[PDB]
Amino acid sequence: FDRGFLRPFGAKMKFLKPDQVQKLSTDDLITYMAEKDKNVRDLAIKLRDAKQDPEIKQTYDKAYEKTKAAAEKLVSEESLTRDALLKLTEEQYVEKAALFDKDVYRNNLKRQTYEKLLRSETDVLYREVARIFIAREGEPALTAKIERLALTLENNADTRSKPIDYLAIAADFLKNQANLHADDPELNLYKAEIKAREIEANRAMKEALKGADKLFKRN
Amino acid sequence: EFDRGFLRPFGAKMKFLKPDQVQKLSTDDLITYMAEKDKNVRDLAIKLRDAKQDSTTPEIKQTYDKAYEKTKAAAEKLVSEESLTRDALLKLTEEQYVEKAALFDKDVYRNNLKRQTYEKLLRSETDVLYREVARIFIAREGEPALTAKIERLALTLENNADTRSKPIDYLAIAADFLKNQANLHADDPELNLYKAEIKAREIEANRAMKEALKGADKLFKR
């Protein structure tokens, strides 16, 4: 099997400070960013698949330039200035620092993992409660509660905050129902499990930001 | 308003009684008592409520009485003096014993629920994390390399099948792959984080199961 710039499975990652990465060859840079950034990994795959393949001789060079530009953009001196760094969101700042620091990468990964699991768990758990709600109160009663809650979340939403998704609605329904029925161990265990991943993801995000500001010193 | 035939409203506080007290309940009170604890009696009470709605026509009533008897028998079977003897209870598996005790003890019910919840989430989590690792494995080593590793692991687990007790599941193989890969590549924080998360739920579910068994033994005195 041929992996064009992708390292083997479970290979220990190599971390360098932004200035050191800027000194790498384009082939050493692509390998570097491919193991840390999913977009550069995806682009390196499309480059590998088209590497082996006249009119296609140029589609390979078009693919190589797309990977080279994407990899260079993540270390571009323009994006590493304190002004350009201050322009970034907390998530963007952490995701950038994760490219150059072992501990930032690990904590950003922990955050992303816990957020993935929170979405997954929220779904599974909402659907469990949905079955019980439908059995005890009927489908029209549930659809009405969700419609109402979705509308309150929409009306009380800040133009600045993230849009309302299934995760926000389901997670709120689960928390609200738990709070309205304190004597339900099932509902309350579900709320506990949601709050658990939430705490985990936030703790990881703050520790990722701590390391980010230690690396960049955005002030 | 909506009609719930013997099912209690959503979020209603559960009532727990010792077997002897439950044996003294009326059939209507017994059905309500069991439907909030046992899924089979709940399902049967639903089918029984659907049959009552059709009658409210004399040949349809026949299927309603057949449904009422099925529920009555299922509810009574869970409290039969025959199933509550020390010998009949010792014939049950640890899971069956705990599931029976969960009908009469608040704390057993809660710990059995915790176990069932953690097991539900472990399945869900195993799929999410496997799929993440599967993507990375395919990207770095190819699909034939992954299919081969899974076939090999499934075969080793089949070779040592007697151990598992629960069947060789598509999600049991995934969980093993995730743990084995993290162990083979100790310097992979991603693989090792996914191993940690799976082991966590396993510990959670087992801790709940042992505490549920502790209570079950306290109630039934095995």
Distance from CA of B19 to the nearest CA of A (A): 22
Give the Cα separation of B68 and B51 in Å (integer).
9
| Cα B65 versus chain centre, distance | 30
Burial class (CB in 10 A: 0-12, 13-18, 19+), A122: buried
In this structure, what token pair is assigned to residue B64?
A: 């309603």
| Cα B174 versus chain centre, distance | 20
Give the Cα separation of A48 and B83 in Å (integer).
66
Q: Do B139 and A45 touch (CB under 8 A)?
A: yes
* Selection from A46, A39, A41 nearest residue A13 by Cα: A41
Contacts of A188 in chain B (CB under 8 A): none
Distance from CA of B192 to the nearest CA of A (A): 10
* Selection from A32, A31, A7 nearest residue A18 by Cα: A32
HEC string for chain A: CCCCCCCCCCCCCCCCCHHHHCCCCHHHHHHHHHCCCHHHHHHHHHHHHHHHCCCCHHHHHHHHHHHHHHHHHCCCCCCCCHHHHHCCCHHHHHHHHCCCCHHHHHHHHHHHHHHHHHHHHHHHHHHHHHHHHHHHHCHHHHHHHHHHHHHHHHHCCCCCCCCCCHHHHHHHHHHHHHHHCCCCHHHHHHHHHHHHHHHHHHHHHHHHHHHHHHHHCCC
Angstrom CA distances, A178 to A76, A182, B38, stand at 49, 6, 21
* Selection from A174, A134, A145, A169 nearest residue B9 by Cα: A134
Quote the Cα angle for A116-A121-A127, to 5°. Answer: 135
Chain A's closest residue to B201, CA to CA, is A193
Q: Do B140 and A8 touch (CB under 8 A)?
A: yes
Asked if B149 reaches chain A (Cβ–Cβ under 8 Å), the answer is: no
Asked if B190 reaches chain A (Cβ–Cβ under 8 Å), the answer is: yes
In this structure, what token pair is assigned to residue A117?
A: 């699991």
Contacts of B140 in chain A (CB under 8 A): 3, 6-9, 11
Asked if A214 reaches chain B (Cβ–Cβ under 8 Å), the answer is: no
- How many other C-beta atoms can be found within 10 angstroms of the C-beta atom of residue B205? 19
| DSSP string computed for B54-120 | HH--TTTHHHHHHHHHHHHHHHHHTT-TTTSSHHHHHTS-HHHHHHHHTTT-HHHHHHHHHHHHHHH
User: Which amino acid, B127?
Assistant: D
User: Which amino acid, A20?
Assistant: Q
Burial class (CB in 10 A: 0-12, 13-18, 19+), B10: buried
* Selection from B139, B122, B127 nearest residue B209 by Cα: B122
| Cα B183 versus chain centre, distance | 30
Q: Do B9 and A137 touch (CB under 8 A)?
A: yes
Mark which residues 5-34 of A lie under 8 Å from B by CB: 6-12
Distance from CA of B162 to the nearest CA of A (A): 31
SS3 B134: helix
Contacts of B42 in chain A (CB under 8 A): 135
Chain A's closest residue to B187, CA to CA, is A12
Q: Do B185 and A138 touch (CB under 8 A)?
A: no
Burial class (CB in 10 A: 0-12, 13-18, 19+), A134: middle
Q: Which of B13, B142, B189 sits opposite A1 (nearest CB)?
A: B142
- How many other C-beta atoms can be found within 10 angstroms of the C-beta atom of residue A148? 10
Contacts of B171 in chain A (CB under 8 A): none
- How many other C-beta atoms can be found within 10 angstroms of the C-beta atom of residue B110? 20
Residue to mutate among B46, B109, B132, B140, with most A CBs inside 10 A, is B140
The pair phi, psi for residue A20, each rounded to 5°, is -70, -40
* Selection from A204, A211, A209 nearest residue A118 by Cα: A204
CB B126 within 8 A of CB B198: yes
Documented resolution in Å: 2.9
Give the Cα separation of B28 and B48 in Å (integer).
12
CB B129 within 8 A of CB B178: yes
Give the Cα separation of B18 and A209 in Å (integer).
54
Angstrom CA distances, B101 to A29, B24, B33, B214, stand at 62, 18, 14, 10
Mark which residues 56-115 of A lie under 8 Å from B by CB: 105-106, 109-110, 113
User: Which amino acid, A106?
Assistant: R
Give the Cα separation of B24 and B21 in Å (integer).
5
Q: Do B193 and A113 touch (CB under 8 A)?
A: yes
Give the Cα separation of A197 and A122 in Å (integer).
10
Q: Do A136 and B189 touch (CB under 8 A)?
A: no
Quote the Cα angle for B83-B84-B90, to 5°. Answer: 80
SS3 B185: coil
Give the Cα separation of B16 and A65 in Å (integer).
69
Method for this entry:
X-ray
Per the listing, tokens 């393949």 go with A53
Burial class (CB in 10 A: 0-12, 13-18, 19+), B9: exposed
- How many other C-beta atoms can be found within 10 angstroms of the C-beta atom of residue B64? 17
| DSSP string computed for B154-172 | HHHHHHT-TTTSS---HHH
- How many other C-beta atoms can be found within 10 angstroms of the C-beta atom of residue A81? 11
Quote the Cα angle for A144-A149-A151, to 5°. Answer: 95
- Tallying the residues shown for chain B, one arrives at 222
| Cα A75 versus chain centre, distance | 20
Half-sphere exposure of B57 (CA within 13 A, CB side): 5
Residue to mutate among A2, A6, A9, with most B CBs inside 10 A, is A9
Question: CATH fold of A1-219, please?
Answer: Methane Monooxygenase Hydroxylase; Chain G, domain 1 (1.20.58)
Given its phi and psi angles, is residue B8 left (phi above 0), alpha (psi -120 to 50 degrees) or beta?
beta
User: CA quadruple A175, A179, A184, A188: dihedral positive or negative?
Assistant: positive
| DSSP string computed for B24-55 | TS-HHHHHHHHHTT-HHHHHHHHHHHHHHHHH
Give the Cα separation of A134 and A142 in Å (integer).
7
CB B110 within 8 A of CB B216: no
Half-sphere exposure of B86 (CA within 13 A, CB side): 3
The pair phi, psi for residue B89, each rounded to 5°, is -75, -35
Give the Cα separation of B129 and B127 in Å (integer).
6
Asked if B148 reaches chain A (Cβ–Cβ under 8 Å), the answer is: no
Angstrom CA distances, A200 to A99, A180, B174, stand at 22, 25, 24
Give the Cα separation of B68 and B35 in Å (integer).
13
Give the Cα separation of B53 and B76 in Å (integer).
24
Asked if B39 reaches chain A (Cβ–Cβ under 8 Å), the answer is: no
Please report, for chain B, the start and end positions of each structural domain, with discontinuous segments joined by +: 1-222
| Secondary-structure class of domain B1-222 per CATH | mainly alpha
Q: Do B140 and A105 touch (CB under 8 A)?
A: no
CB B7 within 8 A of CB B48: no
Burial class (CB in 10 A: 0-12, 13-18, 19+), A41: buried
* Selection from B195, B135, B184, B189 nearest residue A104 by Cα: B189
User: CA quadruple A188, A127, B194, A208: dihedral positive or negative?
Assistant: negative
Q: Do A10 and B120 touch (CB under 8 A)?
A: no
Chain B's closest residue to A194, CA to CA, is B121
